Amino acid sequence: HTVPRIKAITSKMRMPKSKGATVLNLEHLLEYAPQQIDISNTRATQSQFDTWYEAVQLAYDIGETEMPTVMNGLMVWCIENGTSPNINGVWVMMDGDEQVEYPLKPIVENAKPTLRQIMAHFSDVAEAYIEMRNKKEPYMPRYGLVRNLRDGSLARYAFDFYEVTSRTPVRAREAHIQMKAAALKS
Amino acid sequence: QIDISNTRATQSQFDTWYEAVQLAYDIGETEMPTVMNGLMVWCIENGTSPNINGVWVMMDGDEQVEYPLKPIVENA
Amino acid sequence: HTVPRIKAITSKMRMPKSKGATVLNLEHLLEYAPQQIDISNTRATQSQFDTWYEAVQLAYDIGETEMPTVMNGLMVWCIENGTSPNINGVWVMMDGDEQVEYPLKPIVENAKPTLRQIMAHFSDVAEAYIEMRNKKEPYMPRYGLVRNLRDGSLARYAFDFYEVTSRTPVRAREAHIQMKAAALKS
Amino acid sequence: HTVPRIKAITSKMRMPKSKGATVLNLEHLLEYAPQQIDISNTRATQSQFDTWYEAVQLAYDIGETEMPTVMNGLMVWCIENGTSPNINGVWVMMDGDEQVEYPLKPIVENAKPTLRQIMAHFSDVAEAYIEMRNKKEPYMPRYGLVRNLRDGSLARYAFDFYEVTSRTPVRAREAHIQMKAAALKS
RNA sequence: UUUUU
RNA sequence: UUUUU
RNA sequence: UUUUU
RNA sequence: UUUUU
RNA sequence: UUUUU
């Protein structure tokens, strides 16, 4: 009489078995819903990110409360300039009309496995920041200018450490693939 | 078709790998299937090349737990 | 009833967190609006520029009031001739119909990290100066002639130390990319 | 139900055993976290450093309070000039515009196993000092000039007694390897 | 910049 | 990033 | 995976 | 078959 | 390890 429903994982499906015992736990698998970025190797683990954050905070001898401002400045600077392992010298923050420099050693030396993977944690906020800045003036990150990005509307994706995810425009995905290929090309 | 395909590890090889990875983690019979769920999802996201090294990640809710990748690749 | 607005940075966005504490300061990030050229590594820092300016002023034994004229002349000379680290000898100013030479050592030796990055601070004024000079006669900087720039309308961008920014024509950006590639090519 | 964690040192690992008894103490090994430079033979032991410091202080008949200034001067002088066992004569400090010389015998004779290994204790402070000096003028240590170091940004690593550690740039590591090979080459 | 006989 | 004289 | 300054 | 991180 | 003045 009633219309019969179907289970997400069908009852009769070939399953990995060891010693004639199912190797997976379906009860947990159905409820296991980890975000794509939390189980990606292209992004530094939470432990690695915490280690790097603590190391950089200790290197600058900066307190807990002041560190987030430094992190805002570092994210913006990385948005402008690449996050390669080779960057050296000092990165710059603007305290209004005054320029303050911080050493880049602590950031690159403690960033494991890479500074790009560490900054991947800031990818969404970098997107939002570029969106905000573009709402008030033409703000193409310098990485996009180096790559000769002509779209202009792709500025929000045109930084070195952008983490490509499932919920990104296909246009943005293709643009970033092309940009990475061009940058890696000698 | 999949039980007589060389593109798929034999049942004996799969059992050997499963036992080796279970022994490497010092994990019991009951807890291993959860680790296998996490490993399958991680492999779904990231490739299954012989070169993958470091740690693969499971999510115990909002907490990230890492397991060494050596036992998985060396015994496979 | 009323149409509901949306925040620039959405409330529910993945954020970098260390020890279950947000790593960024949104209050400051929203108000953090640093110019693109003030946080660019392709441009010498303000401290480095001040150090170079002071060093060059002291080398010439020139006063505070007379230095800006020397800087005008140096900017024009760099517009004509490249800003490579190799330039040696004397650069030239015109005191009317009289030619006065200044040693190039102090300019190149004190210019850190590079003379190009130091002259990047003069990029906008160089643009304006080339515009002005072109309004009265054909004035293509010698760097554009060496690069065989045929457009003519791109003269305003055809100098060695032009700082490419977000608000530059796409035509100018492509032209300068091609010119830099040609110059670096052996 | 819960996701099972793993121990840093797995329970079932082959261990060195003598007479069927584990030779290592895991409890202490897990907590044993000695800095890399504190267990390196390329650096004089703390006892050797104390012996050398006491010997040099006694040779100069200088008090406890005045010795650190002499040590600052000696570190800077060693930064400029090499720390070979052959250096003889007097090393120089600047008391403003006045030059004061100290005999080099006490420093080299009491420095065991080598003066380079003794000065390795000053490596980090030498790095910082070169960084500071470079922030105000081009300051390449004379050892870098003798080695013909062209990078300029590597000045902070371009002294004889630099102690290569895990947290040093790969660029700096390669540069110092090349510099040491060139210096040792006849 | 030099290197155009 | 540098390498455009 | 890394390699995008 | 392997080689897809 | 030493050998870098």
Residue numbers in the entry:
A (entry chain Ag), C (entry chain Ae), D (entry chain Au): 42 to 227
B (entry chain Ai): 77 to 152
Structure paper excerpt:
Potyviral CP plays a role in virtually every step of the viral infection cycle, from transmission of the virion by aphids, virus assembly and disassembly, regulation of genome amplification, protein translation, to cell-to-cell and long-distance movement. CP consists of a highly conserved globular core flanked by two large extended regions with a high frequency of structural disorder. The C-terminal high intrinsic disorder region (C-IDR) is partially conserved and packaged in the lumen of the virion, supported by the helical ssRNA scaffold. Here, we show that we can control the shape, size, RNA encapsidation ability, symmetry, stability and surface functionalization of nanoparticles through structure-based design of CP from potato virus Y (PVY).
We prepared VLPs consisting of the CP units lacking 40 C-terminal residues, i.e whole C-IDR (CPΔC40), and analyzed them by cryo-EM. Interestingly, we detected only two different architectures of filaments. The structures of the CPΔC40:r and CPΔC40:h+RNA subunits and the helical parameters of their VLPs were comparable to those of their wild type counterparts. This indicates that luminal C-IDR is not essential either for filament formation or RNA encapsidation. The absence of C-IDR facilitates the accessibility of the RNA-binding site, resulting in a significantly increased proportion of VLPΔC40:h+RNA filaments. VLPΔC40:r and VLPΔC40:h+RNA filaments are long flexible and hollow nanotubes with an inner dimeter of 4.1 nm and 3.7 nm, respectively. Third, we show that RNA can be encapsidated in VLPs even in the absence of C-IDR. Here we show that C-IDR does not play an essential structural role in the filament formation or RNA-encapsidation, however, it does affect the fine structural details in filament architecture.
